[PDB]
């Protein structure tokens, strides 16, 4: 017909505090759908407060599955080039909530040692950190030829939608914005976005080839950027428009307020 259709699985939760519960259920369902011989399944974690609650929920209700049964190998979709123990570290937050009790081989942080080996982190520092994380992912997961570049294929990618419609640290204007060959790249936040630190990020081509993608989005204030992913024919789009090209199983987990214009 006249337009390409994008039909992700949409789950709308009544209370924004129900999103972590639905995300946890989805992740556990994906784990149990996979034969134990394919475990551990690769997950790329997002930062932020909804993820932090999802990871605390996994820790309180699914520790046996993750620690004893080694169901998941935890990677980061992005990381701030700040110390591994800083308040702005995605690894620091995931570690406090969950990863402190996960076997060490199943926890794969970005090496951020370049911070404090330099006075001010610059683009070239971020790029060497992205290349180092790419090599780490390639070793642990292996890679494959995709769309005719060899890309690791993540089992799960967890994403959050920013107020500017960014995801991971993929910003309009970033090295990552349209990156279709490298698995990992870099991004600096746009003017309205903090913290003002360089980030290592997975690229669109990596997310596009993940077996499962789970986007968490809340707030009436993100309804415009969400509509620019979901609507077929809008004039203006956010950078997360690329999620329409996802090859895997896509789930959007929403609150009522962000979902007011959807036919859910």
Automatic annotation (TrEMBL):
Which InterPro entries does the record cross-reference, listed alphabetically? 6-phosphogluconolactonase_DevB, 6PGL, Glc/Gal-6P_isomerase, NagB/RpiA_transferase-like
**GO-annotated molecular function:** 6-phosphogluconolactonase activity
Catalytic activity, reaction form: 6-phospho-D-glucono-1,5-lactone + H2O = 6-phospho-D-gluconate + H(+)
CDD domains, alphabetized? 6PGL
EC number(s) given by UniProt: 3.1.1.31
Q: In which pathway does it act?
A: Carbohydrate degradation; pentose phosphate pathway; D-ribulose 5-phosphate from D-glucose 6-phosphate (oxidative stage): step 2/3
Organism taxonomic ancestry:
Eukaryota, Discoba, Euglenozoa, Kinetoplastea, Metakinetoplastina
What is the main EC category here?
hydrolase
Task: Give residue ranges for domain Glucosamine/galactosamine-6-phosphate isomerase.
Answer: 16-246
PANTHER family, sorted: 6-PHOSPHOGLUCONOLACTONASE (PTHR11054)
Q: Which UniProt keywords apply?
A: Hydrolase
Q: State the protein's purpose.
A: Hydrolysis of 6-phosphogluconolactone to 6-phosphogluconate.
Q: What GO terms in the biological process aspect are recorded for it?
A: carbohydrate metabolic process; pentose-phosphate shunt
Q: Which organism is it from?
A: Trypanosoma cruzi (strain CL Brener)
Which family, according to UniProt?
Belongs to the glucosamine/galactosamine-6-phosphate isomerase family. 6-phosphogluconolactonase subfamily.
Does the record carry Hydrolase as a key word? yes
Q: What is this protein called?
A: 6-phosphogluconolactonase
């Amino acid at each position: 017909h006249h337009h390409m259709s994008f039909k992700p699985k949409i789950i709308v939760c009544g209370s924004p505090a129900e999103l972590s519960g639905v995300a946890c259920k989805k992740i556990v369902e994906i784990i149990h759908a996979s034969e134990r011989t394919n475990w551990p399944l690769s997950i790329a974690l997002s930062g932020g407060s909804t993820p932090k609650m999802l990871y605390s929920l996994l820790h309180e209700e699914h520790l046996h599955l993750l620690k004893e049964e080694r169901a998941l190998r935890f990677f980061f979709g992005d990381e701030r080039l700040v110390p591994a123990d800083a308040a702005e570290s995605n690894y620091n937050m995931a570690r406090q909530a969950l990863l402190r009790d996960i076997p060490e081989d199943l926890v794969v942080p970005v090496d951020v040692g370049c911070v404090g080996k330099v006075s001010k982190v610059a683009c070239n520092d971020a790029v060497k950190s992205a290349d180092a994380y790419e090599k780490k992912i390639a070793l642990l997961l292996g890679t494959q030829k995709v769309e005719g570049a060899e890309i690791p294929v993540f089992d799960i990618v967890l994403l959050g939608l920013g107020s500017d419609g960014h995801t991971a640290s993929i910003f309009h204007g970033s090295q990552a914005e349209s990156e279709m060959h490298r698995a990992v790249s870099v991004g600096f936040p746009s003017p309205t976005m903090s913290p003002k630190v360089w980030r290592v990020t997975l690229t669109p081509i990596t997310i596009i080839h993940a077996r499962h993608v789970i986007l968490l989005a809340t707030g009436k204030e993100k309804k415009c950027v969400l509509n620019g992913i979901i609507a077929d024919t809008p004039t203006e789009v956010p950078v997360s428009r690329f999620l329409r090209n996802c090859k895997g199983d896509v789930t959007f987990i929403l609150d009522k307020e962000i979902a007011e214009n959807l036919t859910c």
